[model samples]
Target chain A: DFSITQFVRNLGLEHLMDIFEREQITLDVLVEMGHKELKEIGINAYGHRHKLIKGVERLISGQQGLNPYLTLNTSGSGTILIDLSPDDKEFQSVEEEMQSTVREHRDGGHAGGIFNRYNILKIQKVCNKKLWERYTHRRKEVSEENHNHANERMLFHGSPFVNAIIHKGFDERHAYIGGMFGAGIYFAENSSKSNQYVYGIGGGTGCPVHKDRSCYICHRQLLFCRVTLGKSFLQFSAMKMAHSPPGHHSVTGRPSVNGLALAEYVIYRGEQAYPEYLITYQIM
Target chain B: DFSITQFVRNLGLEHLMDIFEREQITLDVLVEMGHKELKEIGINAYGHRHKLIKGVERLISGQQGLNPYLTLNTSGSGTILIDLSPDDKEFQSVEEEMQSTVREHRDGGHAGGIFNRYNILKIQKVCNKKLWERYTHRRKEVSEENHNHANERMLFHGSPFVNAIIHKGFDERHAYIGGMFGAGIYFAENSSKSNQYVYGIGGGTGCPVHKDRSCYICHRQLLFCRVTLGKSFLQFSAMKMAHSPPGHHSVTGRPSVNGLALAEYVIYRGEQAYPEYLITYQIM
Candidate 1:
């Protein structure tokens, strides 16, 4: 119950708490302000600013330290999964990304994906602490102009549960075969495209986790992944190649071409992609 | 790289990183210190103290907000799972707690458990955000003298994966049967007792997740749970009761008693328990 309001009241700045509340000035936000910003925010009293600054000085020391790499084939030592609520703005923004990118693949491209209304259940932000370490370690070791290949993009990949992708990450061994890029882990800008892979067949609708009244099951585990594209091979034509073209870290297939469904990404190295969030949604 | 040392150095206190480093003056720790501690720690200069305090005020504003709950049954909307490394002091502490409690449940007690030198792979801290909400909500609604019965205990519950207990929480439906206290979700103060539940069978050692290399697989998922015992019925003798006795929130079987192994806890309500961590280990 104690929050920014209690914080200000404790300082005898009961008058300022109203302003703090309106401004959504949390403890973290309050610690950043100086006399000028405080004055602008209507904490005009010099004494109030002094008291606030002193109070925040104590707050600053209370924070914790932080410390990642990744590969998909091997299981990791640990992970930090932070689930953002359905109402969370961050979760909503991801939905927006998934929604906005739900474009038609058009002529020649397979229109296997469909996007409508979905009731998002939850968004679990995965900080696979050890997997991240593996990922970052791989990035750091490629010390050259190649490091410039650290092209990062937020993409989507959905899969049925073997244990789910959170612990083991993206394993090409488990990746579905017969894609625009053959036998490689596929990622898409559009979540609708990825939904095809999220079989909860517990439905060869073959769902992965065997548990349900699973006729077109409402439950689908959709993943929001962050990938290091590095240098990409843009394939306009569907190739049966598993890995990217030589020198390219990953492959990107253009939409509406080569039987592409969504603009898809293919990476041979699991380290190139990290599944950052698991967004579980129910088809509304 | 921005840490407690960076925090102090930002204030032009280059002379103190050595001392700060030695004393482990992290940002959180730094903010807790005031003039008295500062002077004692050799920041005698008044101007320097002012600069440092001012520096921390800004540092705190850069920090993020945090949130949490309890529960075992039903799927949750979200979770925040933090994996502590094998070397993590906190992880080690849990191991000690597990080790310290591994007592002999002699005299009519079955001895089916064993604990030895096992190389720990990782310790993942599970914070099922929605499950926690469900748990705390249940607790809040029980606003009576029962609130005083909120006897919280750090216990252990090991299970096989359905989608794993992290996402779905614990379900008594999937709980192991043929226990000292029938088929309620069994919990133990001694982890060795709980290890009997951590079957990685893929081994009817039936490991739940069907990935490979069977035959007493090194992989076992051990969970450290937090439970609200809330006036438990201490049953020295084994019983086939599913729910707790009337006026009791849970059941606890005494160690060294009739057919009991370690001290066991049983709760029918999923909300009474919250799995806080998943410690995955590899038997050495």
Candidate 2:
């Protein structure tokens, strides 16, 4: 029933010949009769005028690509990320106290009372600027416009890595210094169960192993290449066919050895990037 | 612009006649062409077996019109109202007692609670059977189908007239009266306020003015007429002509006047039987 010859024969399309001839005759007759009949009908019909109009208004103004990263992580040489008000400063100090209490607890000390006593004071200080501004904006907008919907607030603050490392234990104990802002903060080591490997509170220790450097000092140069891109590059580099040492048949330049003929469609005409290389950048 | 003869001359359609003649010629040519192909193509070129089968199927089944009145009114008089339980009856009595207490407080016992407790008990008695049937059917269907949506119950029970009429008082009193079934319980009275009529419970110790016959009794007859017609027959009967009435004008004999042109459009055009009429047919 599935005849290749019959399908090939259909490609010539003899059935469509009458339709093609009818179209030809229609065009020929219309052209031959032309303006004489039009004049006799006392009508002046000609080709339609070309339209010239551009439509649609542009609204948003931005570059057409992925949004650029805002948070940044500085190569540590401990940086003063941002200055804050007296309240914020007090809140930061309270956070440092909590961190110390946690450390004391870890070292077998009962400092639960100390942590509990300052919890309320810490919350008040933290809410003084951030939450107060958020509440005020919501109240004003709701009362004036009669709108009860919630609005997001933009909080200007340092990343948790900088807050924990640079501010908390940087002076007393030897700790890897981490500072972040915008896109840099996002690139710092992630500790949460999220999609990114950005800066956060806990994941890996940040102590420098070298004798010359302080124990707290992070190998910032190595962190970018070694911790980030180093892992990715190594995985991709291992996937190349040329990188395979000459031994048990290389995956490249080989075809199936069974007595079946090669399919023209299945074979690639040109060389292509390795699966991992394409998977990471292009095909993915 | 006023040349009528010229306008008539221009209205003559010679071109239309020529077109009609040409169309006839074309139709004849098409018939001839089909006749010429009869020997070459003895059967249908396209598979029209499905069309033939559908045509035969259509011959076996007649067309049907759907019932437009899908939901019956759940709360009304006679045979269509929901039945009440003992708890509902007790609740109705309590409500009546409360209403009477309130009236006694207002009237100081001199008038002796003259305000007729608008017989919600009677209304409910009239409403229950139909309401119960509708509710039970809906509940059974929903339970059988496992439709747990709360709004589904609302859809099944949504009677526009019942929804419009029944309120707290109606709910309590109608529950007590051993209500019969009906849908819309619209209120109509001979007066703006019928406070003194004692055959019913409104105001006073006034008797049915004529023990044997009264205007109140006459009005009851009219009410019966209106209920059967679902329109006030007296009002319709009294409609005077726009230009001629009571021997004032005689230019047109038996002059016709317009009423509601839309009354013709009411789909269910028929009379309903009264309760008294139904009682005559019950042999048991």
Candidate 3:
């Protein structure tokens, strides 16, 4: 674990330890905050700010490629639907192993998790790279000017999902994501109709995505538990997956695309499966 | 000088003194409170609530007719225009005297003033007479049930002006009224139009009350100083004057009428009179 104490000590800014402790700026808060927040909390020197940002970035990068959920498979006609049954020992073992791994990772790490990956990817997608570079490089100039510039860059930047995690804070974001994954799961059944790919789930229902009807990801959908995954997490994960370079095909072999295209993979739990919870993710 | 303690004592409900004291129910707070609020603060007994309500009514009624602003006149075709110059001694003296009287009433009395008159008149205009009578008469019933029933009646019953004073408390209501009368001075220039009477002020301006354009009195107009007297006071005075059965007359020989038909009397300070605030009133 790259603790804040060790990070500050490595930078020879040990005097900041008391201030961090007093303000309760743990590794989590430190990782979440940007330059403005750091300056607001008395980290005013340009060198200190630059060093702190670098250390935080280093810590985040060290935990990359570790999330079990970030698995990818690329062998089908750009889309694959997998089904799991509790009765199948092979599927049951895999599910249990994945859950245990997640729990273990949650218990062990303080600075890195699924959220860190999502946040980093979200920053990449939403923020202007030029603006971000300018902000990072001009750390010695007028702090107020840089602060305003950074705020300008973040204004109207991310999709609702990315913005929710950034602005709504951790508790609400986690509760919403947790609620979606915990309830009303469904499984996708692959099918074809007249030259276009169609997938059915649970019952004979058609794919939610079509030429006429686009995916509607909104608060009402989340409230009614209409979708398998909540919009924010689904949108975030889909966006990150889509933005991955061609050679980095992991989750799905489908060409890089946004939520509009990714909507083809979503499936709702059928009426017959009301009391039973299952979810299916179709990757193309 | 009708204090809450004295009023409560007169009701022979001295046993509830501790409850009132603990709740900090002053005469002002008591006056503004509804039946439900009284019941909530231990005035739960039907007999007690009835006695308290009657006491409040008595206090309110005693202060009526004493407000100088409540004066009205009626006789002719229901409209006449009156003008005043800043240099005219008679008009200046009368205006100054009226203002002093308003200030004196505000400073001297605990129970009555223009607000009391406005509140009483507003209650008359807004409240259902039959419902009010029934509530007052059936005060011996279950206090909570009747309280809820009374609240249901007044829920959306009144004009915005009436509800503002009732909801916003006394100090704000008085401040708003005082601001209207205390600001800039203007002169009135009277002129007559066709069979329909029209009075102009400050310049050769037309009547704000036209056939197509009726008098619209809203809180925003009052806040922005659009009319001479704000909507609440104007509406209060107009309603009271209109309801004065056939013989009453004081300020002008105009027949009794409400704002809709009483369009004969509206005064705008005029374009030329912007820097100098002036208002003209017409009564026929």
Candidate 4:
């Protein structure tokens, strides 16, 4: 009954309740229903049909001793399955609910999720605000010596956006760009440590001699933002270069003053940039 | 003795083995030793000391009935622990050996791991060549009708670079840039499906009006490269936009023809661009 309610809510097919009642579309009935049967019941929208099929599949898998709340389908049937354990049902359900909210925000034309490019700034802002509050609060609670030392080593220094990217994963093109910009980008070592990887964000252009230079300003801003809004687990190296053999002309020269200036300009002027606006200036 | 051998190999401290032996630094002794003790043994290099401490902690945890090969140190107490089962020691040892290889590659200034940036290109080249060969071979083995259909619907089609990026995890900064370039970037919907994400390439700069345009040329090159050296699992969608909110001025405009031209210029001229040369033209 709960699953049916959630399914109906997801599909926005309240009118189908009568049909479901008439057809006795319980978990068992839904599980047995195939494409032809779905058509017979009038689920014609491809997305709707897809979701319903997945919903029913989840129900069946749950009945067969698998966790029903798992969202990723490992069955290789092109169906999205929830792979959570039974003990994790609540967490999975909450996650599903959050995704539904994200879907709603996306459908409503807002940035919606962490993956949305437009939301990058918003993510940074919120993450920074949260980190600042947490840091400030913790500082007040602890002794001055411990607080001072702890401030330098705060691990959860990146924003939720950064967290999501690390946890959820991004594509190769981005990795390439990230590498170029000296964002300290690397692949997650393995599936287990995958979520703990970081995208270091400063000094790719090399350390600056003056505080007013672009690299210095951008580096400071990234560090500040990271400390205030980001998580603690990301690699926080200051001057990471992408290429190894050191023959790349672009990386070896004096840091691009103009590039750093451009980054600082965009950051301070509030110009919008995609994905990681903080690091975008490096490429621009 | 085996652990000590492995430790020496990891830290390049074969000379220090005499010191370790003099100090009677067996696994048990090392486990009980802390910072002060390490300094006393002349194991003073910060990195080596850290790794040795971790290695000993893992060994101790393994003897204490913890899983011996767990890579991440979930255990606190400043001790590294491998949480593998006793029966799985051989498998754990093999994994450690593999990590050592990864460490070697990394230390040698190459993107040595499965997720290194330089390794992305190498992986892409190898995967693409293998896939191209596989597809060609498979095409010859199958019937014409089946082959024709299979050719149209080859699911794994993507460049080796794309494959590496998706298989390895990148930061979200790259994700945004990827989305901007029409790389069809998306987040994995679930943990199990996390690594199955795609970074679509080409056709992002609105469909070319004619085959002569830079967009068209670049798109074709990307597609050609993908099919020749890539697999078939990536989503090959064209003309994906980053923002759905209908208000981002940059994204709403027609694709940049100059960007595509620059991309083509770099590719043919063999000039290197930072981070995003592969998908740079799409955003240019």
Q: What is the DockQ of candidate 3?
A: 0.01
Judge candidate 4 against the unseen true structure and give its global Cα lDDT, from 0 to 1: 0.32
Instruction: Give per-residue CA lDDT, model 3, range A135-162, as digits (tens).
Output: 3443222212211111110001011132
TM-score for each model:
0.35, 0.15, 0.16, 0.16
Worst 10 residues of 3 chain B by lDDT: B149-158
Among these predictions, the greatest lDDT belongs to: 1
Which stretches of candidate 1 lie above 4 Å from their native place? Answer: A1-77, A104-115, A141-149, A200-203, A206-217, B1-284
Which ten contiguous residues of candidate 1 chain B have the minimum total lDDT?
B66-75
Q: In what order do the candidates fall by TM-score, top score first?
A: 1, 3, 4, 2
lDDT digits (tens) for residues B1-284 of candidate 2: 12222322343422333433434422222223233342233324222323322332332233223321121122244444333342553334323322332221233322222333323222122333444454445434322221111111000011112322222112312221211111222222211111222123232342335432112321221110111111111222222222212311111111124432111101011111111100000000
- What's the residue-level lDDT of A147 in candidate 2? 13
Best by TM-score: 1
Docking class of 3: incorrect
Tens-digit lDDT track of model 1 for A1-284 = 24667778888888876788788776656767888999998877799899988876655544312100112113435667787766755666666656655554342222233346566777787877767887777565432224222555667876666245787776667655667677777888777666656663112333334432222455677888767776567777777876767766778888563355457888877776778777877643
Poorly placed runs, candidate 4 (over 4 Å): A1-19, A22-173, A176-284, B1-284
- Candidate 2: regions farther than 4 A off: A1-284, B1-101, B105-284
What digit string (tens of lDDT, one per residue) describes model 4 on residues A23-104? 7786545666788888888777677677778767666665657665343233322212132232443333222222222211
Against the unseen true structure, what C-alpha lDDT does each candidate score?
0.64, 0.22, 0.30, 0.32
